[PDB]
Amino acid sequence: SWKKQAEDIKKIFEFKETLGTGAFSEVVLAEEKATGKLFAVKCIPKKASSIENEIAVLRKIKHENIVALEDIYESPNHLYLVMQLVSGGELFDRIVEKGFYTEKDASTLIRQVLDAVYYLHRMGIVHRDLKPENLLYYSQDEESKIMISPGYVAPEVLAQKPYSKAVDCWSIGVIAYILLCGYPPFYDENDSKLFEQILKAEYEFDSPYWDDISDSAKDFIRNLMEKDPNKRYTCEQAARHPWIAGDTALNKNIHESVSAQIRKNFAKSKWRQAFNAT
Amino acid sequence: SWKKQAEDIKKIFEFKETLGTGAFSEVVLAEEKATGKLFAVKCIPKKASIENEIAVLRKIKHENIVALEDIYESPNHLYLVMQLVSGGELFDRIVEKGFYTEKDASTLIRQVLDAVYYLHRMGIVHRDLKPENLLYYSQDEESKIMISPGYVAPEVLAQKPYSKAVDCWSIGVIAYILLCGYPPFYDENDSKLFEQILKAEYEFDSPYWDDISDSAKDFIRNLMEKDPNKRYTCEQAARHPWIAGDTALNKNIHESVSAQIRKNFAKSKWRQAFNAT
Numbered sequence A: 001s002w003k004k005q006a007e008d009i010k011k012i013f014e015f016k017e018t019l020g021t022g023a024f025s026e027v028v029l030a031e032e033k034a035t036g037k038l039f040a041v042k043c044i045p046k047k048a049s050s051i052e053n054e055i056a057v058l059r060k061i062k063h064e065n066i067v068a069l070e071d072i073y074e075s076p077n078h079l080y081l082v083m084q085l086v087s088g089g090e091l092f093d094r095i096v097e098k099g100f101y102t103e104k105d106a107s108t109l110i111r112q113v114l115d116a117v118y119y120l121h122r123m124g125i126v127h128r129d130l131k132p133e134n135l136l137y138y139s140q141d142e143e144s145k146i147m148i149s150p151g152y153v154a155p156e157v158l159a160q161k162p163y164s165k166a167v168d169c170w171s172i173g174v175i176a177y178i179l180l181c182g183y184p185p186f187y188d189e190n191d192s193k194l195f196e197q198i199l200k201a202e203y204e205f206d207s208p209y210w211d212d213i214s215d216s217a218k219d220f221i222r223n224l225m226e227k228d229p230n231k232r233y234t235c236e237q238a239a240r241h242p243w244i245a246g247d248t249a250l251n252k253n254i255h256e257s258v259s260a261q262i263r264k265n266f267a268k269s270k271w272r273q274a275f276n277a278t
Numbered sequence B: 001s002w003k004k005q006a007e008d009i010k011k012i013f014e015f016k017e018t019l020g021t022g023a024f025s026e027v028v029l030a031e032e033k034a035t036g037k038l039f040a041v042k043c044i045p046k047k048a049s050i051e052n053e054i055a056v057l058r059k060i061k062h063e064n065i066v067a068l069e070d071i072y073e074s075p076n077h078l079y080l081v082m083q084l085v086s087g088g089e090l091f092d093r094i095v096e097k098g099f100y101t102e103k104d105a106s107t108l109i110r111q112v113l114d115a116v117y118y119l120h121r122m123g124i125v126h127r128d129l130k131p132e133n134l135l136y137y138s139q140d141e142e143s144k145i146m147i148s149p150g151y152v153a154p155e156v157l158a159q160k161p162y163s164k165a166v167d168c169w170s171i172g173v174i175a176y177i178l179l180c181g182y183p184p185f186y187d188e189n190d191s192k193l194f195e196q197i198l199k200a201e202y203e204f205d206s207p208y209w210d211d212i213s214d215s216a217k218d219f220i221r222n223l224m225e226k227d228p229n230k231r232y233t234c235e236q237a238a239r240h241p242w243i244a245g246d247t248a249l250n251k252n253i254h255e256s257v258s259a260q261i262r263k264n265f266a267k268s269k270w271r272q273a274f275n276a277t
């Protein structure tokens, strides 16, 4: 509930192009006039507490693999979230264009996510919405770090039970699954059928897509995609797993099958459609 | 109307001692924890316009005006973070000085002219300039001075609309006090005082003004002019020879001025606020 008097955000930042536009908000590229440094600024009309309490928590979050919230401004009519600019694109586009892709690349990505999420957990924060579409590269560099910016929901949430930090560990297992075959472990006929399958937590390592994948990777995922949240790995536990901390992650090229599956399964991007706008 | 999410002011500053307590507020010495820099923080409960006024203040940036660095708000309080000045009150310095001249008074009025001229360019009328709110930045002997009823201009009493001219009158009044140690208008019965102020009837009384230059008296006459349309602006006052030239005398007048200060300004509102409860 603490504030200070600021100037007009238009006097502090030069608003350049719109990056994307949503149902209720808009994200603009903004240059800080004093420094020339660039930020992505989310502009939210107030006409759209709770959000005031939520956004204060985000301000506290400082981690190398999480997009930083650098400031929140307020006018009578709007909120402005000054966010760290990342310019490396979406995870799925990178993998598809990559040329070579292996278990070590997947494990390198999952290791950074576990670090980010384990930091949130220590800080007392459950993300609740972890999914590969909101994983963005920091920069266009080949070796760039990854940044955190219905089929993914944990069984205990479907089962109307109170959520915990375990919910996020489930989501990390689903992300690990997709990073190694390019499709989701649970997919609908009806949302009815999908719900019942997540509740039972019945999924496969299906042939042929999973035949080249190590037992170690599969073990890793079974410990995160565990139905019972009390049996499921924490982030700290998962980060000690040999697939992450050891040398069991294979270095075979699986790009061909993974890329084809992503093309089929992740052919629509909400970033792209926010850009396509109004 | 523009604000940023901030942290608890007490997480950014260590609040040390209370410097003073008023009817409605408290000033507390505070150390910025990241820097070790000291500020004077005015804490005002919301349980007692002011939004608009505070905004203007944050824009005021001049070396001879106490700066407003930041304003914090909690659900119940406003916290004005102010530049700390530590040289004490003008009147106390003069009284303890040992030696005091027209050159000293003129140096002091030159600074105030520069500060008030800046306020005027920025579109701001002070409206309450008085020597009791002039404080020294530091204890150094050559410290700059800082801006932090018998002083009010004739047109204000004449129930006319105030302009910037009002501050220039106040500078004349300050210049007068600085050269003799007593106010140009005083009467036990303020029916008579009102009439003297309305008519701008004051003296250069003897013997106190005997050793003062005709140049000083001429400068005050142009500032303490009854008609705001005939009265000097700060820009014009600053170009007067007593300010910009060398008509300011180098004769010690501390004896008479200090005696008069001791008689006329024995009470301090800063000391009263300190004394507290």
Ligand SMILES: Cc1cc(Nc2nc(-c3ccccc3)nc3ccccc23)n[nH]1
Residues within 6 Å of the ligand: A019, A020, A021, A027, A040, A067, A083, A084, A085, A086, A087, A088, A149, A270, A271, A272, A274, A275
């Ligand atoms: C949360 C966030 C997003 C960004 N960057 C970003 N974000 C978007 C973006 C696209 C669609 C909706 C919202 C944001 N587009 C971009 C294009 C080119 C470079 C960066 C970029 N930085 N931080």
Ligand SMILES: Cc1cc(Nc2nc(-c3ccccc3)nc3ccccc23)n[nH]1
Residues within 6 Å of the ligand: B019, B020, B021, B027, B040, B066, B082, B083, B084, B085, B086, B148, B269, B270, B271, B273, B274
């Ligand atoms: C507006 C302002 C006041 C001050 N300083 C200050 N202010 C006071 C002060 C005294 C009484 C009421 C309000 C403030 N007392 C002080 C004592 C010793 C050093 C500095 C000091 N700095 N900025």
